[PDB]
């Protein structure tokens, strides 16, 4: 995360770290949506241009974390993966369209002060909150700059951007399964996700029921925090039918 700040303790208890078993290293962010299911970006698991194609046994999820590098004894919980599910129409060839994946844990994780699931949006909450100017929150342990790395989880609040502005900021073909967020060059403030934040959540706190909803998944950006560029996020609600189908079928 670029130009963010240290998270407070328990500020993002749905935050998940995808961790490589060997060598032991951070792979991506992710989020906890129930005691058995974790949501992430498809490109965290499958990205052929970079020879990336992880299997269940390659990975661990670490839940309840704050420190990036420390083993947080008595606080974090580490889970093995039972199964990975990638959206069948995930477009890794062109533009990361439908950049979404689910991971089912081998065993349910115990909730605690530091571990707790985020809500997924319903149609009404999405319609109400996914509007230009409305701010969401992005969290992760990714790099602090494009070109270094944080001691603890980072957080940044960023405004959703008008679709035509998103489209005009890039040569990449944007789709309805994406939204973009970030400050404009003339807005002064800045901030973005970066390498390593992939798969983490873009959340919003509903003013109607005071609950946190995951509206987006950290997907892509041309560099990190560049003037005139924006971060692009998977539109979780648009893909919720697929999420539900998977959970109903394999839960």
């Amino acid at each position: 995360i670029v130009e963010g700040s240290d998270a407070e303790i328990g500020m993002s208890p749905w935050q998940v770290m995808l961790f490589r078993k060997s060598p032991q290293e951070l792979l991506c962010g992710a989020s906890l949506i129930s005691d058995r299911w974790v949501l992430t970006a498809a490109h965290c698991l499958l990205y052929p241009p970079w020879d990336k194609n992880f299997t269940e046994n390659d990975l661990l999820v670490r839940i309840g974390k704050h420190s990036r590098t420390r083993y947080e004894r008595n606080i974090e919980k580490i889970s093995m993966l039972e199964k990975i599910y990638i959206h069948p129409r995930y477009n890794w060839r062109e533009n990361l369209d439908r950049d979404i994946a689910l991971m089912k844990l081998k065993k349910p994780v115990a909730f605690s002060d530091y571990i707790h699931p985020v809500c997924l949006p319903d149609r009404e909450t999405a319609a109400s909150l996914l509007q230009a100017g409305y701010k969401g929150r992005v969290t992760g342990w990714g790099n602090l700059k494009e070109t270094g790395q944080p001691s603890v989880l980072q957080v940044v609040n960023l405004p959703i951007v008008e679709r035509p502005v998103c489209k005009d900021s890039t040569r990449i073909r944007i789709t309805d399964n994406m939204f973009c967020a970030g400050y404009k060059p003339d807005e002064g403030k800045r901030g973005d996700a970066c390498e390593g934040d992939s798969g983490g959540p873009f959340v919003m706190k509903s003013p109607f029921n005071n609950r946190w909803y995951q509206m987006g998944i950290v997907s892509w950006g041309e560099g990190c925090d560049r003037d005139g560029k924006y971060g692009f996020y998977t539109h979780v609600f648009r893909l919720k039918k697929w999420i539900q189908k998977v959970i109903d079928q394999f839960g």
Binding site: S5, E8, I9, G10, M11, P13, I33, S34, F111, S112, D113, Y114, H116, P117, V118, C119, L120, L129, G133, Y134, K135, G136, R137, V155, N157, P159, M204, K205, S206, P207, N210, R211, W212, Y213
Partner: peptide, 28 residues
């Protein structure tokens, strides 16, 4: 499920984090 999105150290205790107000103010 029923309890999703309510943080044990924040919403469950009626404590606010340091920047959530920034989000609320943007929801016009």
């Amino acid at each position: 499920e029923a309890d999703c999105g309510l943080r044990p150290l924040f919403e469950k205790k009626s404590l606010e984090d340091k920047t959530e107000r920034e989000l609320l103010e943007s929801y016009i």
